[PDB]
């Protein structure tokens, strides 16, 4: 067929009960996730083709970069806690990756006072049980598909996005087929 178990996807063995509906995972300290979010703009590009009524849902992982990579997980809490994904994505990518500016916790915090949260406020939500709760998902749910990984992406908690089974010729095309694969998934 077009689409094949094992081709554009895999089917999880052991399903996951009560999964977000579309979840990606990465780390701040992972290359090809660096690219997925800057050079490629999966996740956004994913949301532009989603039927209507199915929310997108991005965990940071702790398995890359030690005891930096824990911190980032917070960070990711704390960010997802006050609604500014969409100002600390970029900064701390290339803080991490491209500048090599993000070494400890503090570095972490500068970028979100950067971009404008108050310091008294990203100390409170950093500390905040919120936010430990929202560490404790992201564990979860990573647990909860064993995995190994990032960048990765899990359909209803049954399916898994297989992106080696897709031609790299062309970037553009590359995100399409990743894209409507997720289209497909999320109507089967």
Request: glycine share 6%; charged share 25%; proline share 4%.
């Amino acid at each position: 067929a077009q689409y094949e178990d094992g081709k554009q996807y895999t089917t999880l063995e052991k399903p996951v009960a009560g999964a977000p509906q579309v979840l990606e995972f990465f780390s701040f300290f992972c290359p090809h996730c660096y690219q997925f979010e800057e050079v490629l703009h999966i996740s956004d590009n994913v949301k532009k083709k989603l039927p209507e009524g199915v929310k997108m849902t991005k965990y940071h992982v702790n398995f890359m970069g030690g005891d930096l990579g824990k911190d980032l997980t917070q960070a990711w809490a704390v960010a997802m806690a006050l609604g500014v994904e969409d100002k600390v994505t970029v900064p701390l990518f290339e803080g991490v990756q491209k500048t090599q500016t993000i070494r400890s916790a503090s570095d972490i915090r500068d970028v979100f006072i950067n971009a404008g949260i108050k310091g008294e406020e990203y100390d409170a939500a950093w500390n905040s049980f919120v936010v430990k709760s929202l560490v404790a998902q992201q564990e979860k749910a990573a647990a909860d598909v064993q995995l190994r990984g990032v960048p990765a992406m899990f359909v209803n908690g049954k399916y898994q996005l297989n992106p080696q089974g897709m031609d790299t010729s062309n970037m553009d095309v590359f995100v399409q087929q990743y894209a409507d694969t997720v289209k497909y998934l999320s109507e089967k």
